Amino acid sequence: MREIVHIQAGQCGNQIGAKFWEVISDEHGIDPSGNYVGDSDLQLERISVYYNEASSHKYVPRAILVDLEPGTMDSVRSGAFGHLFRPDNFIFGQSGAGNNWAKGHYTEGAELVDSVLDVVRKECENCDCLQGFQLTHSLGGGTGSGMGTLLISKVREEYPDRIMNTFSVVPSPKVSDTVVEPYNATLSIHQLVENTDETYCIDNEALYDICFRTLKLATPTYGDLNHLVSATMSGVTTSLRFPGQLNADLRKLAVNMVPFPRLHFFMPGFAPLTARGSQQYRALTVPELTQQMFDAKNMMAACDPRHGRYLTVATVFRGRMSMKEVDEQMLAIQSKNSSYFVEWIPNNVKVAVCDIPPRGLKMSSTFIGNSTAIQELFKRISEQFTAMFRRKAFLHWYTGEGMDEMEFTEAESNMNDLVSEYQQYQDAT
Amino acid sequence: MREIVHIQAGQCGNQIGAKFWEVISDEHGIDPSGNYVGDSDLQLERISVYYNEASSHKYVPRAILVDLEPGTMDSVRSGAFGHLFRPDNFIFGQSGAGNNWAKGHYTEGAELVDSVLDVVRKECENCDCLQGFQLTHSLGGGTGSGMGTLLISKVREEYPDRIMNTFSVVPSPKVSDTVVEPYNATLSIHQLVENTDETYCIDNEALYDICFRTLKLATPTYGDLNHLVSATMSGVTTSLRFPGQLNADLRKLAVNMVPFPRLHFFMPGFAPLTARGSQQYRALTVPELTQQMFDAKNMMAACDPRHGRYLTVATVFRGRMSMKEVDEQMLAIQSKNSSYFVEWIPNNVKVAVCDIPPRGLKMSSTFIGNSTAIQELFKRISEQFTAMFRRKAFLHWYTGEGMDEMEFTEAESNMNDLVSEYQQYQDAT
Amino acid sequence: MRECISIHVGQAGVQIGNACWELYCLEHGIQPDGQMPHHHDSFNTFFSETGAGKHVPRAVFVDLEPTVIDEVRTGTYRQLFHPEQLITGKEDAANNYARGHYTIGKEIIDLVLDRIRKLADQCTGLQGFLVFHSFGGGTGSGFTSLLMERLSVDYGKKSKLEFSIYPAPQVSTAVVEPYNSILTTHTTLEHSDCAFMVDNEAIYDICRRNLDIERPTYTNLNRLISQIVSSITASLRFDGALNVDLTNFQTNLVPYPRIHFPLATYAPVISAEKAYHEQLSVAEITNACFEPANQMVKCDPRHGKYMACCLLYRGDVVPKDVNAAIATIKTKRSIQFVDWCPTGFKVGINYQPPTVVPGGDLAKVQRAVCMLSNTTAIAEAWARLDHKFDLMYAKRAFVHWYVGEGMEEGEFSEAREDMAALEKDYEEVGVDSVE
Ligand SMILES: Nc1nc2c(ncn2[C@@H]2O[C@H](COP(=O)(O)OP(=O)(O)OP(=O)(O)O)[C@@H](O)[C@H]2O)c(=O)[nH]1
Numbered sequence A, B: 001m002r003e004i005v006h007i008q009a010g011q012c013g014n015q016i017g018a019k020f021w022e023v024i025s026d027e028h029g030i031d032p033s034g035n036y037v038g039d040s041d042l043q044l045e046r047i048s049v050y051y052n053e054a055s056s057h058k059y060v061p062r063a064i065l066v067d068l069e070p071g072t073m074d075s076v077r078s079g080a081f082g083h084l085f086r087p088d089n090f091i092f093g094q095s096g097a098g099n100n101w102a103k104g105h106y107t108e109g110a111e112l113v114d115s116v117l118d119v120v121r122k123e124c125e126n127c128d129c130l131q132g133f134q135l136t137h138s139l140g141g142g143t144g145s146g147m148g149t150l151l152i153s154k155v156r157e158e159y160p161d162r163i164m165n166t167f168s169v170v171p172s173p174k175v176s177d178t179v180v181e182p183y184n185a186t187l188s189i190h191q192l193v194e195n196t197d198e199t200y201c202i203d204n205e206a207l208y209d210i211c212f213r214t215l216k217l218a219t220p221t222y223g224d225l226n227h228l229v230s231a232t233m234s235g236v237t238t239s240l241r242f243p244g245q246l247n248a249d250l251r252k253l254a255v256n257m258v259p260f261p262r263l264h265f266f267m268p269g270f271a272p273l274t275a276r277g278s279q280q281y282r283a284l285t286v287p288e289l290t291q292q293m294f295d296a297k298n299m300m301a302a303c304d305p306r307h308g309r310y311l312t313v314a315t316v317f318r319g320r321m322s323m324k325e326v327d328e329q330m331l332a333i334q335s336k337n338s339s340y341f342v343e344w345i346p347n348n349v350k351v352a353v354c355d356i357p358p359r360g361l362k363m364s365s366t367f368i369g370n371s372t373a374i375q376e377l378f379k380r381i382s383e384q385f386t387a388m389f390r391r392k393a394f395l396h397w398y399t400g401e402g403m404d405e406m407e408f409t410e411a412e413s414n415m416n417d418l419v420s421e422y423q424q425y426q427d428a429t
Numbered sequence C: 001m002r003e004c005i006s007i008h009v010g011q012a013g014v015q016i017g018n019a020c021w022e023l024y025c026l027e028h029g030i031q032p033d034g035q036m037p038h039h040h041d042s043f044n045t046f047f048s049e050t051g052a053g054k055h056v057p058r059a060v061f062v063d064l065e066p067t068v069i070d071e072v073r074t075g076t077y078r079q080l081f082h083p084e085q086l087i088t089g090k091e092d093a094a095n096n097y098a099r100g101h102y103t104i105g106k107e108i109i110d111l112v113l114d115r116i117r118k119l120a121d122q123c124t125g126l127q128g129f130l131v132f133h134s135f136g137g138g139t140g141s142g143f144t145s146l147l148m149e150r151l152s153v154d155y156g157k158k159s160k161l162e163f164s165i166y167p168a169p170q171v172s173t174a175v176v177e178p179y180n181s182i183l184t185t186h187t188t189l190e191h192s193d194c195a196f197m198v199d200n201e202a203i204y205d206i207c208r209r210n211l212d213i214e215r216p217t218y219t220n221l222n223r224l225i226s227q228i229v230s231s232i233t234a235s236l237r238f239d240g241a242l243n244v245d246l247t248n249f250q251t252n253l254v255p256y257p258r259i260h261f262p263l264a265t266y267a268p269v270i271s272a273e274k275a276y277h278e279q280l281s282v283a284e285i286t287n288a289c290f291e292p293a294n295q296m297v298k299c300d301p302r303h304g305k306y307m308a309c310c311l312l313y314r315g316d317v318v319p320k321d322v323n324a325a326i327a328t329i330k331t332k333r334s335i336q337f338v339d340w341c342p343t344g345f346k347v348g349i350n351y352q353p354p355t356v357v358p359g360g361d362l363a364k365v366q367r368a369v370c371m372l373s374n375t376t377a378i379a380e381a382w383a384r385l386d387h388k389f390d391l392m393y394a395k396r397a398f399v400h401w402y403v404g405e406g407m408e409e410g411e412f413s414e415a416r417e418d419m420a421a422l423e424k425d426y427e428e429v430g431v432d433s434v435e
């Protein structure tokens, strides 16, 4: 029951989804061929939430991988652990979006979302009781950004009374992967603010800092980055995937962390992160787990929480622990660290505890903070977009495929209004 | 309970500390790999004072080894008995202080002081009830004397209600290891006199004479020199690590040995010290232990006590003895040798007894005397500093990295003020 | 029916009590684990009786440092004590009166009083408290002075006996002993009923000559002090021809409200080999307890005068030769009484001979004498300590540790004038009275 439909967009979505399904199959004891090989029955107790049963006791993921360029699909099909996805779900075009929001939203988007919506409707009607949607993408690319936006809009139109999470790879401030980032970032963020429910912003430079400093890795790669992101996502889902002392669901998290309809940009974090050599010199316990959780250096978004106030915080533990210790340490953290907590939201900490530890670990924890440090990211993106649009660069290639400057002005106004409201609620008494 | 944090700065501190944790591990029966191997259960009764319990019954020392150059950490890490320290505590820079105080207190030490303090603070929270700090450094180097002072000032600003000890190695009159010794020593004492509860001063040639005429050694290397200091360092703490007839602790000594806030420069000592060949011709008993430690020949600081008067005296016995024998002789020593004891301090002797003898000995002790003869050491350093400062020799690489002439003339007036008050109490009636 | 509880404060109190409760468990035949293998009850006054055959002591062990309580928790007397009674802190007072009386000892006093109330309410015929504490320590001299201010308020008028450890003139461990002792005496002078003094140096000489030993560790001294403590409360637990309760000492040894400092004495103290060649009659153990070399405080009674006395015999003792021996003692001119005390003797005879612990230095005897004398000669002990305090305070040595830990410089002056008045009163009334 409570099935979740997973949608992956662009190269980043495809790679992150591949790592995510690797982690989920390892967690549920599913062989790469697609048949159960595990030992305990607690894995089989709730497997329909992500997987889907099929004849000869096979299990097929409920994922819909789609991207305009066929290279990622060919890679995921030819590589290992590609024998279990359903080929019908493999949807692709011929020519990529070319880092163009207009091309990804108005040119290939038409047919691509027609086919994707057909597949989505079939999967949903096959589902018994739909719980929500998951979409992993990037706000910097063309196909991922534009076509994920179109998919989100169509899914919102079709299923108004449903939840969906978006895992967005936000552009970095230091080094830009693409020259025209701000246009796509602004348009995508405007559309998401319009018609999404919750969004977990994830950066790349912050992940690289985490991997180099904490994990002590010399050559951090996209494999490790996607591993970290997938671990965070699995930690998020495990609360309803597995039984526990104090269960939590996606709707519970949304209710507890979203105080206002326009404030759903969270910062994720994971604990514990330790190097291979220095893992036997630490005592795994809730005190040190929370201590590692609640420091800025262990933040997956390139925003320093010391520059803002935590509007709300959620903490999903795993493994076996003591609720007395958990609540006592939460109270201690709140009392010692009151300065950067919002005064008019008393009791601004949500805690959930599961009962199944991750593979090869005694206990872990996932932290999700709705803070006011995203204001700086939105301000930086808005400033870059303002400069680029004022000098009118790269814009005739968004105007030449349907759009106009009215859309850009509206998106910039919406972004500025959002950041102003965010600051004004940070500085409220 | 009542655990202490060990901080080792400079090269001498790392070399002394590398031999200090050899004695503590042998006392508690801790294998070099880090797992308990001892037999008696009294050793493990109080292990949290120095060691830290980890996963799978592993013990990791509560030490923070830091030095500006990476040459010293290579030896301890790559050498034997370097498999038990935590790699996080190994903090080092790239370029040494170059025997400069300014390069270890303003320029290079400011880069590392924000990283070690994040490990000192982390160690305190995991600690149950902090007792105090222990610092081993040198007064003639650049990082041991410059940066070790910086750590003292910052720690004292965060834990005011704590007691810390400095096992400094004060320079020597006969030979100078570095040409610019007085500039570093004078500038460090001006800071150690303000943010330190007690300080144990140790010379180098006074350890050579002891190893020559008493231990009967012809070529005493630094391995046989730091071994003798470590025994004294481990004798102060042993009162709060093992049960005894008359217990003491770090705070208990500071009350008895420090009559005034500025007069806290002590002279340690040890007994028995006998050669390997000539240990069968002596009867190990209390009457000869007290006789051996009260002569000017057996003193680890090259200052003859006959030139001054003992203000207060401690005597931390070990082994198993009779309380009547101990208290009978310290009266005889005081009565027979009443000439060099201060008159306005009746009963200027503190005695404590433990119950666990040191490894390979029936009984031992440790002598700590707050004598007035230390005055003659500060008089000499202030004499050498004055001669160099008038000609402004070597001074222009201290002014070139932050400092100035006005700073020097205040660190020497304070030094001369202490000497004046260290003598007006010797002749006071 | 008659209940009294004992409080042990500091290391000296805990170590003494570790040997005192080894003696009570042997007199009443109580196994170390609380089970059982003049008597009809006996143990009811000290051992509260639980549902099963187990008896638990009415003791409250309190200390600030935990390095000595865990010795009791681990030692052979582990199953006896009630685990909730053993109260311990985090860090000691470090020989500081301020730390153990104003700042550190104030975070634990509320817990200690809870255990006292939970013990007094269970009993019905509570008589008084026994406090075992030192004088030169930090938590044995500053924390025990906080208990009397609180116990004397919750319980209005009850006898509060003490068993102190006076700092010896020559042999001494602490350096700030004159500071702790003067401050404690000035504060406990109003909330105490009778403070017995025992010196560490005097017992060294007693255990050296009479017992003929060479290595008298602290275990030997504590085994001898406990005999006096058990001799005082011998009439409570056993029948006798002439009983003496706890309140009898208050109205017989304290002529004035400020002069309540008797000094204990025990006899006979002989070795095992010397016991065979001695008759051990009543008429000579009385003589042995009166010689100046057998007193347990380093002061000679010859210099002073005996204000009052109290002899507590036990064993095979006839009430006739006790009178004859005492009458001879008064006639001897070595001792002398005060003019305003025509009668100065109080006797008490018990029917229980003293017991001997296994491996003890003392030998089995059938007679014993515990003499508690309130004499003027103790005034020389206050003068010596008052000179040490004035010597260090003139140069203001060690003061900065007390001032910065919750005290004012004026407190040291008040504690000095009080000891000057007490010393003056101890000789003004001990001198001859005109007319
Ligand atoms: N965390 C993470 N991010 C990635 C990874 N691979 C790519 N990205 C990000 O995703 C963006 C790629 O843009 P996409 O949306 O995939 O665009 P595309 O699929 O190449 O097609 P076009 O939009 O037409 O350019 C880059 O800017 C990267 O920052 C990855 O392996 N891990």
Ligand SMILES: Nc1nc2c(ncn2[C@@H]2O[C@H](COP(=O)(O)OP(=O)(O)OP(=O)(O)O)[C@@H](O)[C@H]2O)c(=O)[nH]1
Pocket (backbone or CB within 6 Å): B009, B010, B011, B012, B013, B015, B016, B067, B096, B097, B098, B099, B100, B137, B138, B139, B140, B141, B142, B143, B144, B145, B169, B177, B178, B204, B222, B225, B226
């Ligand atoms: N007792 C003892 N003293 C030592 C030993 N090794 C070095 N020393 C002393 O330590 C001093 C060295 O100065 P340090 O403070 O260590 O200087 P450093 O750590 O090399 O850093 P720089 O001052 O920048 O060179 C010398 O003057 C020696 O007297 C040792 O093994 N035992």
Ligand SMILES: Nc1nc2c(ncn2[C@@H]2O[C@H](COP(=O)(O)OP(=O)(O)OP(=O)(O)O)[C@@H](O)[C@H]2O)c(=O)[nH]1
Pocket (backbone or CB within 6 Å): B245, B246, B252, C009, C010, C011, C012, C013, C015, C016, C092, C093, C094, C095, C096, C100, C134, C135, C136, C137, C138, C139, C140, C141, C165, C172, C173, C174, C200, C218, C219, C221, C222
């Ligand atoms: N007779 C006797 N005296 C003892 C014994 N142990 C300690 N003392 C006395 O106690 C004195 C030390 O002061 P204490 O009150 O015991 O110190 P403490 O109880 O550890 O409390 P702190 O002062 O805070 O450390 C010494 O001078 C001894 O004379 C003992 O076993 N027997």
Ligand SMILES: [Mg+2]
Pocket (backbone or CB within 6 Å): A010, A011, A069, A096, A097, A143
């Ligand atoms: Mg592409």
Ligand SMILES: [Mg+2]
Pocket (backbone or CB within 6 Å): B011, B069, B096, B097, B098, B143
């Ligand atoms: Mg160096």
Ligand SMILES: [Mg+2]
Pocket (backbone or CB within 6 Å): C010, C011, C065, C092, C093, C094, C137, C138, C139
């Ligand atoms: Mg103590």
